[PDB]
Design an enzyme around this catalytic site. Structure first.
Site, mmCIF file in Angstrom:
data_model
loop_
_atom_site.group_PDB
_atom_site.id
_atom_site.type_symbol
_atom_site.label_atom_id
_atom_site.label_comp_id
_atom_site.label_asym_id
_atom_site.label_seq_id
_atom_site.Cartn_x
_atom_site.Cartn_y
_atom_site.Cartn_z
ATOM 1 N N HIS A 6 7.242 39.301 -22.130
ATOM 2 C CA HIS A 6 5.965 40.033 -22.370
ATOM 3 C C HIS A 6 6.176 41.540 -22.205
ATOM 4 O O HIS A 6 5.315 42.285 -22.737
ATOM 5 C CB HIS A 6 4.751 39.593 -21.607
ATOM 6 C CG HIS A 6 4.907 39.404 -20.144
ATOM 7 N ND1 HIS A 6 4.601 40.314 -19.184
ATOM 8 C CD2 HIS A 6 5.332 38.323 -19.486
ATOM 9 C CE1 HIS A 6 4.826 39.829 -17.978
ATOM 10 N NE2 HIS A 6 5.324 38.638 -18.140
ATOM 11 N N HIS A 52 7.177 48.700 -15.359
ATOM 12 C CA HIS A 52 7.202 48.168 -16.710
ATOM 13 C C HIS A 52 6.251 49.006 -17.594
ATOM 14 O O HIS A 52 5.545 49.851 -17.022
ATOM 15 C CB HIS A 52 6.912 46.665 -16.898
ATOM 16 C CG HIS A 52 5.526 46.422 -16.367
ATOM 17 N ND1 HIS A 52 5.233 46.170 -15.043
ATOM 18 C CD2 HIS A 52 4.343 46.493 -17.058
ATOM 19 C CE1 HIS A 52 3.911 46.111 -14.908
ATOM 20 N NE2 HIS A 52 3.393 46.304 -16.154
ATOM 21 N N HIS A 107 3.597 49.176 -21.301
ATOM 22 C CA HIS A 107 2.758 48.489 -22.327
ATOM 23 C C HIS A 107 2.821 49.505 -23.513
ATOM 24 O O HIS A 107 2.664 50.697 -23.218
ATOM 25 C CB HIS A 107 1.272 48.353 -21.892
ATOM 26 C CG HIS A 107 1.212 47.414 -20.679
ATOM 27 N ND1 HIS A 107 1.110 46.052 -20.813
ATOM 28 C CD2 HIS A 107 1.346 47.664 -19.372
ATOM 29 C CE1 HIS A 107 1.162 45.514 -19.591
ATOM 30 N NE2 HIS A 107 1.292 46.457 -18.732
ATOM 31 N N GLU A 118 -3.234 50.783 -21.919
ATOM 32 C CA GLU A 118 -4.229 49.814 -21.436
ATOM 33 C C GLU A 118 -5.450 50.583 -21.017
ATOM 34 O O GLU A 118 -6.540 50.351 -21.563
ATOM 35 C CB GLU A 118 -3.614 48.986 -20.279
ATOM 36 C CG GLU A 118 -2.530 48.032 -20.849
ATOM 37 C CD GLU A 118 -2.296 46.832 -19.952
ATOM 38 O OE1 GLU A 118 -2.110 46.904 -18.759
ATOM 39 O OE2 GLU A 118 -2.270 45.770 -20.605
ATOM 40 N N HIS A 160 3.534 51.342 -15.721
ATOM 41 C CA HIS A 160 2.987 50.814 -14.455
ATOM 42 C C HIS A 160 4.080 50.681 -13.357
ATOM 43 O O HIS A 160 5.057 49.961 -13.655
ATOM 44 C CB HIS A 160 2.307 49.419 -14.700
ATOM 45 C CG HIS A 160 1.063 49.544 -15.546
ATOM 46 N ND1 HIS A 160 0.481 48.528 -16.242
ATOM 47 C CD2 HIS A 160 0.272 50.614 -15.842
ATOM 48 C CE1 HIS A 160 -0.595 48.920 -16.905
ATOM 49 N NE2 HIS A 160 -0.749 50.205 -16.652
ATOM 50 N N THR A 186 -3.058 43.142 -15.146
ATOM 51 C CA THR A 186 -3.471 43.151 -16.529
ATOM 52 C C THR A 186 -2.865 42.048 -17.322
ATOM 53 O O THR A 186 -3.184 41.897 -18.535
ATOM 54 C CB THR A 186 -3.468 44.573 -17.160
ATOM 55 O OG1 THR A 186 -2.081 44.830 -17.468
ATOM 56 C CG2 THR A 186 -4.197 45.682 -16.424
ATOM 57 N N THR A 187 -2.051 41.180 -16.679
ATOM 58 C CA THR A 187 -1.592 39.979 -17.391
ATOM 59 C C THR A 187 -1.918 38.818 -16.429
ATOM 60 O O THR A 187 -2.099 39.044 -15.191
ATOM 61 C CB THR A 187 -0.006 40.034 -17.612
ATOM 62 O OG1 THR A 187 0.523 40.351 -16.267
ATOM 63 C CG2 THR A 187 0.365 41.260 -18.460
HETATM 64 MN MN LIG Z 1 1.136 46.489 -16.394
#
Ligand SMILES: [Mn+2]
Length: 258
Positions: free
Chosen positions: A62, A92, A94, A104, A117, A196-197
């Site tokens: 992901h 990580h 996004h 995000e 993040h 957020t996941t």
């Molecule tokens: Mn994140």
């Protein structure tokens, strides 16, 4: 089937397996700058990453995570709205399939090309796994990325992506200093939110920096070359791994500045 960011398993479907998806303190959110309240009682953030030990980089299907040794107080965050010390465990990103999307959090509805993040866990809880079961267990520093000039400190990351192209692949990644990813200013917005996941746990104090860092177009291009799939499976590029903004509900966003 298992969650992801496609049409059939995307964010709009997550609530079926993770009901907390429709909870009261879900993230990300849109930061309305005119409604965020300046709070003079918030303290300056304290980032101590000089002793940071990175270990590895992994494609988990992901995103890609850089992981740090968190067995001791080597890279910590404290101050700001936090009580206690938070140890960095991993960072990580996004990102989007285009430069106009990917972050995000949004600011006055503006989306950035990507969002970094830095994940930290509250040491009073003893381990990451216990910290996620607490309302104040995690603290995430989010930094926006915009496309412009290249970020020198991000190049070591860009360069190893080829070796962790597909899901499950990992590579040794020592001596990476995350100080090369910070903007000049540490002014921020803060609010109580969630991961957020999935599992979308509401254990996060979000600390979102006002100043974005710039990356070059070529840098962001290499992110978009990763795969969601595993080796020898049909190719699905890793793009748009971002959750849309969720309702603020009963929460206030506080600003460390005016
Ligand atoms: Mn994140």
């Amino acid at each position: 089937h298992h969650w992801g960011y496609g049409k059939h398993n995307g964010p709009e479907h997550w609530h079926k397996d993770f009901p907390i998806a429709k909870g009261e303190r879900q993230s990300p959110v849109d930061i309305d700058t005119h409604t965020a309240k300046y709070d003079p009682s918030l303290k300056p953030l304290s980032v101590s990453y000089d002793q940071a030990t990175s270990l590895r980089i992994l494609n988990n299907g992901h995103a890609f995570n850089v992981e740090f040794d968190d067995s001791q107080d080597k890279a910590v965050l404290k101050g700001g709205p936090l009580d206690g010390t938070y140890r960095l465990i991993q960072f990580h990103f996004h990102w989007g399939s285009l430069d106009g999307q990917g972050s995000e959090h949004t600011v006055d509805k503006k989306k950035y090309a990507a969002e970094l993040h830095l994940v930290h866990w509250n040491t009073k809880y003893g381990d990451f796994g216990k910290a996620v079961q607490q309302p104040d267990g995690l603290a995430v520093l989010g930094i926006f990325l915009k496309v412009g000039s290249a970020k020198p400190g991000l190049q070591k990351v860009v360069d190893v992506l080829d070796s962790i192209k597909t899901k499950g692949k990992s590579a040794d990644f020592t001596n990476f200093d995350p100080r090369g990813l910070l903007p000049e200013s540490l002014d921020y917005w803060t609010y109580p939110g969630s991961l957020t996941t999935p599992p979308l746990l509401e254990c996060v104090t979000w600390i979102v920096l006002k100043e974005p860092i710039s990356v070059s177009s070529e840098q962001v291009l290499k992110f978009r070359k990763l795969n969601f799939n595993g080796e020898g499976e049909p190719e699905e590029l890793m793009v748009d791994n971002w959750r849309p903004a969720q309702p603020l509900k009963n929460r206030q966003i506080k600003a460390s500045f005016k």
